[PDB]
Amino acid sequence: ENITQWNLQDNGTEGIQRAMFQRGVNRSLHGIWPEKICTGVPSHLATDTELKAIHGMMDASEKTNYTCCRLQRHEWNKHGWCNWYNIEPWILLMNKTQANLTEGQPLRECAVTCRYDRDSDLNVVTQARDSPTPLTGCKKGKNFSFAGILVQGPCNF
Numbered sequence: 601e602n603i604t605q606w607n608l609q610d611n612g613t614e615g616i617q618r619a620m621f622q623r624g625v626n627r628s629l630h631g632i633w634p635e636k637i638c639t640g641v642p643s644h645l646a647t648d649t650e651l652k653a654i655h656g657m658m659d660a661s662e663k664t665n666y667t668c669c670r671l672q673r674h675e676w677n678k679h680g681w682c683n684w685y686n687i688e689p690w691i692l693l694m695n696k697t698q699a700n701l702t703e704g705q706p707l708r709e710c711a712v713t714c715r716y717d718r719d720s721d722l723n724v725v726t727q728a729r730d731s732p733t734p735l736t737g738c739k740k741g742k743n744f745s746f747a748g749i750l751v752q753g754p755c756n757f
């Protein structure tokens with residue numbers, strides 16, 4: 601029912617993808633997205649201490665040097681409060697999702713966005729999710745690279 605999406609390292613993509621490559625991070629959670637997007641005022645304002653409890657999730661912002669908490673707070677504000685009601689079960693789910701992502705390539709890993717790399721003739725996956733979706737920036741007929749793992753098609757197992 602929820603889309604789980606994450607960033608993947610890629611030295612060829614400026615921003616979080618490059619920062620992850622430099623730090624030896626392969627997968628960094630972007631979000632867990634139910635159908636409903638939160639509108640209005642959050643029932644609770646996420647603190648830095650709460651957001652830092654999602655261990656290994658890197659912020660997409662250079663303003664924190666890709667650490668915490670701009671993306672983490674944005675996730676709680678836009679997808680968290682209205683769906684989970686309380687920050688505690690959301691922090692635990694996000695943290696466990698990230699822990700699984702840190703362990704290696706997950707159960708279902710489908711490409712979302714690629715950076716086609718001319719040199720290696722590979723579709724370098726910059727963002728993946730746990731369900732198939734139409735692709736963006738992915739060259740037809742090329743193999744896919746999920747944080748160095750070579751796959752035939754857009755979905756990795």
Ligand SMILES: *[C@@H]1O[C@H](CO)[C@@H](O[C@@H]2O[C@H](CO)[C@@H](O[C@@H]3O[C@H](CO[C@H]4O[C@H](CO)[C@@H](O[C@H]5O[C@H](CO)[C@@H](O)[C@H](O)[C@@H]5O)[C@H](O)[C@@H]4O)[C@@H](O)[C@H](O[C@@H]4O[C@H](CO)[C@@H](O)[C@H](O)[C@@H]4O)[C@@H]3O)[C@H](O)[C@H]2NC(C)=O)[C@H](O)[C@H]1NC(C)=O
Nearest residue numbers: 601602632633634635682683684685686687688689690693
């Ligand atoms: C996919 O995303 C959804 C979010 O869309 C995730 O579901 C959410 O999971 C949260 C648990 O992790 C759960 O949080 C608890 O919510 C209760 C309140 O629950 C009651 O309210 C809601 C609506 O008002 C109803 O939820 C029911 O919805 C479904 C269909 O009816 C079904 O799942 C089931 O019937 C649910 O019961 C329902 O009326 C609820 O009973 C809070 O009380 C919880 O609080 C915990 O308890 C404390 C107080 O005792 C609180 O202070 C603590 O901090 C404590 O931890 C807790 O917040 C959400 O209700 C649920 N949201 C929805 C819309 O279902 C789902 O888990 C995701 N799945 C995956 C696999 O990623």
Ligand SMILES: *[C@@H]1O[C@H](CO)[C@@H](O[C@@H]2O[C@H](CO)[C@@H](O)[C@H](O)[C@H]2NC(C)=O)[C@H](O)[C@H]1NC(C)=O
Nearest residue numbers: 604692693694695696697698699700701703707
């Ligand atoms: C993190 O990974 C573990 C291991 O895959 C998950 O636990 C499994 O959950 C499935 C159902 O989704 C069950 O069939 C098994 O009981 C579990 N296996 C083990 C070895 O414990 C867990 O769901 C994952 N959590 C998140 C949030 O991704």
Ligand SMILES: *[C@@H]1O[C@H](CO)[C@@H](O)[C@H](O)[C@H]1NC(C)=O
Nearest residue numbers: 624625626702703747748749
């Ligand atoms: C990241 O992925 C590569 C390629 O699969 C693997 O060799 C390496 O050990 C992983 N590093 C971490 C920190 O998980």
Ligand SMILES: *[C@@H]1O[C@H](CO)[C@@H](O)[C@H](O)[C@H]1NC(C)=O
Nearest residue numbers: 619622623662664665666667
């Ligand atoms: C950003 O983080 C990395 C690794 O932790 C480090 O190389 C760098 O000095 C940090 N700070 C700035 C201002 O780039």
Ligand SMILES: *[C@@H]1O[C@H](CO)[C@@H](O)[C@H](O)[C@H]1NC(C)=O
Nearest residue numbers: 653655656692695696698699
């Ligand atoms: C989150 O997962 C880590 C492993 O990455 C674990 O050590 C830690 O206790 C967890 N934190 C919370 C708040 O669950």
